[PDB]
A paper describes a structure:
The MERS-CoV ORF4b protein is a viral accessory protein that functions as an innate immune inhibitor and strongly localizes to the nucleus, despite virus replication occurring exclusively within the cytoplasmic compartment. The MERS-CoV ORF4b protein has been shown to bind preferentially to the nuclear import adapter IMPα3 in infected cells, thereby inhibiting NF-κB-dependent innate immune responses. Here we provide a detailed, structural basis for the interaction between MERS-CoV ORF4b and its innate immune suppression target, the nuclear import adapter IMPα. Our results provide a detailed structural basis that explains how a virus can target the IMPα nuclear import adapter to impair immunity, and illustrate how small mutations in ORF4b, like those found in closely related coronaviruses such as HKU5, change the IMPα binding mechanism.
The structure of a MERS-CoV ORF4b Arg33 to Ala (R33A) mutant bound to IMPα2 showed a change in the major site binding register similar to that of R24A, with Lys30 positioned at the P2 site, with minor site binding retained. D An Arg33Ala mutation, depicted as above, caused a change in binding at the major site to the canonical P2 Lys binding. From this quantitative experiment, we determined that R24A at the minor site binding region and R33A at the major site binding region both reduced IMPα2 binding to the greatest extent, with binding affinities of 238 nM (significant ~20-fold reduction compared to WT; one-way ANOVA followed by Tukey’s test, p = 0.0002) and 471 nM (significant ~40-fold reduction compared to WT; one-way ANOVA followed by Tukey’s test, p < 0.0001), respectively. For example, mutations within both the minor site (Arg24Ala), and the major site (Arg33Ala and Arg37Ala) resulted in the MERS-CoV ORF4b binding using a canonical Lys P2 involving 29TKKLR33, with Lys30 binding at the P2 site. These NLSs all bound with reduced affinity compared to the Arg P0 site. We found that mutation of R24A alone had a small effect on the nuclear import of ORF4b, whereas mutation of R33A alone, or in combination with R24A (R24A/R33A), significantly decreased the nuclear localization of the mutant ORF4b proteins. Consistent with the other data, we found that Arg33 was the most potent single point mutation in reducing the ability of ORF4b to inhibit immune effects in both HEK293T cells and a human airway epithelial cell-derived cell line A549. Because we were unable to obtain similar structural data for an IMPα:p65 complex, we examined the ability of MERS ORF4b to inhibit NF-κB p65 nuclear import during a TNFα response and found a marked reduction in nuclear import of this subunit. Consistent with the above data, the R33A mutant was significantly impaired in its inhibition of p65 nuclear import compared to WT ORF4b.
Numbering used by the authors:
A (entry chain A): 72 to 496
B (entry chain B): 21 to 25, 29 to 34
Amino acid sequence: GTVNWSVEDIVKGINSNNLESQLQATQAARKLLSREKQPPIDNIIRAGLIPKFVSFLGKTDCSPIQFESAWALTNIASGTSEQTKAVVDGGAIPAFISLLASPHAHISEQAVWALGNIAGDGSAFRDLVIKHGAIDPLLALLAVPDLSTLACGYLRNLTWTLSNLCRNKNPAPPLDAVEQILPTLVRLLHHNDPEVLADSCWAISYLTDGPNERIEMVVKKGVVPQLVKLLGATELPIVTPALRAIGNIVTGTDEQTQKVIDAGALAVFPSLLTNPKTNIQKEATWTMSNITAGRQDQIQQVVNHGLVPFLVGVLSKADFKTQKEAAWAITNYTSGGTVEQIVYLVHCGIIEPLMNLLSAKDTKIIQVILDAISNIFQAAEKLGETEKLSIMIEECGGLDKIEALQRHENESVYKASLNLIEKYF
Amino acid sequence: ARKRSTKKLAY
């Protein structure tokens, strides 16, 4: 019937002034564009069919052609930026927004999907979809007493499209749009569907990836406890965005980091810092590095949760990127910590792995390690135990690495190693 | 001690 048509036949059908022939040809086009192996999007565009599909979007008395054209345009907009642009240039944004309020659920869902693709292209088309007034009708679709009454796929698509409306930077989404979307996002963050939860966490992670004012917008809604609860979820697709959002939040002020701590986040990091997925370990160690850059009481809370041994472990054995995050965490710890906290760090066995890491080729990690060692030596100076620390570093074989770095290409490493050897060795 | 900071086809 409408299977395996040529673009020539599709064009002939769509060009006829017979609405049923147009509908059949549009369905054939939808089936072509819905094929997994190289859908012929460029051929459909060159045939000039986008304006016809956009016009069909407005055929209220023929809902099937509305649906078929919306599906075809969705799949066109799912491609490159040029193909999404071809869809936008045909006037599809206002037509899809008008279809959001369709009495046919599948047509409204298809419009949500298409707008999601368009907005996911980037910040420009995101803001253009916002300017055409999509947020109000999108959120009106979720204005139900209980989200469980909605179809699962419909709700997942709405959540994903909203996440795309929260996505991308330079510029970030308009402040008023974020404020308009956030309450529904909190409500969705309390939903029970794993995919809805994952996409809501991704939206929150987007919204928290920015200056402290954006983070504050998010945290004032009271979402941090729910984010911590989701951080301890079993589904990796949920933990990943939740951990990203928590890390973004702790990149902010000390009070926002403290809101993360008060919600019980640290208690999850024994598992996160040993998680078998390298990405989780890296993100969690980065989050820890940003928590150790906070106040001394926050470093103390890190200590009380028994997380210093886990940082020692990550420093001893992990993917190099995770080890570099751990080096940063140790340097921040030593920069902001008390003398007691630093000697505790040393008692947990940090010196040996911190020195073994000096054999790396990256210069930044070497400089970070040297700064951490300088801070540790300063604490020892205040305790009059610099000779014991020097003996410890010498037994580990770190003095050899430092005297070798004295011949390093970078100026900072050269000077720091020479200063260490002249002041303590 | 300083802080350090898609599309879908319908088949």
